[PDB]
């Protein structure tokens, strides 16, 4: 599943999957204008398929729509359209920073999702987090029983994030300053049951630091 | 050199796309570079070198697609797709690299499976005195044979490079394969020279 996921996110023609699907279940209601600008950019996309020098043009797309909007056609041109493009706009910013950068922000999802877990499961024991759960969510017993739930399965959970770390932040000595924020909170997971995701997490901070071959052959 | 085999590790690290797109929109010639890099260790530069080269030839044409395919071989082929938009009132073309003379001649009939607006060109690592006689002659022995270029659809030229670089354009389509006019010239820039100029005359380069 994390090979697939890996290699779908990296295949380009994915957006454009996406966008056919988004446009075909919506043949009306949108303007025929921002329609051509979308149909002429995704026909050039699919054109330079797997092509140096290609990106999903989702900054063309945000460019005809938010175009549109700020001419804002009254009455019936104004609310029809702000609706009925919502799924090119969500597509588009799922896509702003292209498909490497969509397929490092799935993986940080992934990642976030494990620590909105194991972040109540630290700075304290056992009891002190289930009693703190209970009185912040005494409107509902089932967030909590979900809380343990979810830690309970800590170590598949800890495979699962190795093997997504090890696809996110390998063979590209660079990070963001979003990447270092979720790697820094998964590190100070002192609890030793974690140690596997904090120990692997702090070989991406030193990591991605070093020289590539190919400066020192290319200078030499 | 060192833009084009950097790129290659791994592309989309958001300055090696600048240097790119530098050597395309820059004045200064990189011509005499750019025929060179057949491999040079990698075999994906091809694909990089094929789609700078027309990019740094057709500035005069709109284009609005480049693609990259590949043969089931070591052969990866570019195809583009561009128009003029004031002049001679939508063309197409490709190009691809072969080694020293004979994956050209091997593969013709599918590397070209990209009015006569196809514009086909080839380079040939053939880095060795350089002497028009002999390469013509070799490049002309199959053009005189090989007719694909007007029976497939219809290909207006076909150019060859020579890897400081020489170039052969011809047309086996209805005249004698042979140009000593635009021989020297990239078909592309044949336009900044001012040479149509010359309408009332016989010339004889």
Redesign the interface.
């Given at each position: 599943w994390v090979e697939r996921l890996m290699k779908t996110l990296r295949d380009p023609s994915l957006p454009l999957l996406e966008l056919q699907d988004i446009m075909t279940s919506v043949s009306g209601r949108i303007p025929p204008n921002v329609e051509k600008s979308i149909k002429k950019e995704m026909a050039?996309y699919a054109?330079?398929?797997?092509?140096?020098?290609?990106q999903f043009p989702s900054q063309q797309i945000a460019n005809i729509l938010d175009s549109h909007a700020a001419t804002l056609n009254r009455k019936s041109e104004r609310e029809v359209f702000f609706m009925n493009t919502q799924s090119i706009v969500q597509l588009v910013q799922r896509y702003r920073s292209?498909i490497?950068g969509h397929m490092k922000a799935v993986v940080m999802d992934l990642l976030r999702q494990y620590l909105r877990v194991e972040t109540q499961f630290q700075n304290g024991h056992y009891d002190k987090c289930v009693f703190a759960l209970r009185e912040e969510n005494k409107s509902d017993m089932n967030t909590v029983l979900n809380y343990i739930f979810s830690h309970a399965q800590v170590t598949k959970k800890n495979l699962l994030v190795t093997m997504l770390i090890d696809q996110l932040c390998g063979?590209?000595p660079?990070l963001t300053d979003e990447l270092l924020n979720i790697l820094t909170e998964l590190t100070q997971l002192s609890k030793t049951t974690n140690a596997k995701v904090a120990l692997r997490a702090r070989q991406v901070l030193i990591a991605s630091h070093l020289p590539?071959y190919?400066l020192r052959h290319?200078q030499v | 050199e060192?833009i084009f085999?950097?790129?290659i590790?791994?592309?989309?690290?958001q300055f090696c796309?600048e240097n790119?797109?530098k050597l395309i929109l820059s004045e200064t010639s990189i011509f005499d570079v750019l025929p060179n890099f057949f491999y040079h260790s990698n075999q994906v530069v091809r694909?990089?070198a094929l789609?700078?080269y027309v990019?740094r030839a057709y500035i005069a044409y709109e284009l609005?697609?480049?693609?990259?395919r590949q043969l089931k071989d070591n052969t990866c082929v570019?195809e583009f797709?561009f128009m003029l938009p004031t002049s001679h009132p939508q063309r197409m073309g490709g190009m691809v690299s072969f080694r020293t003379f004979e994956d050209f001649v091997r593969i013709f009939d599918e590397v070209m499976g990209c009015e006569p607006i196809h514009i086909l060109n080839v380079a040939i690592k053939t880095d060795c005195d350089i002497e028009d006689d002999r390469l013509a002659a070799m490049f002309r022995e199959f053009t005189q044979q090989n007719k694909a270029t007007l029976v497939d659809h219809g290909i207006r030229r076909l150019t060859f490079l020579v890897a400081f670089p020489k170039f052969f354009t011809f047309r086996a389509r209805d005249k004698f394969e042979e140009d000593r006019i635009y021989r020297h010239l990239e078909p592309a820039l044949a336009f900044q020279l001012e040479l149509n100029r010359m309408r009332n005359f016989d010339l004889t380069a």
């Open positions: 050039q054109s330079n398929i797997t092509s140096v020098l290609c292209g490497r063979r590209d660079t590539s190919e290319n | 060192s085999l950097s790129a590790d791994m592309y989309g690290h796309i790119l797109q694909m990089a789609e700078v990019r609005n697609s480049v693609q990259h570019v797709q």
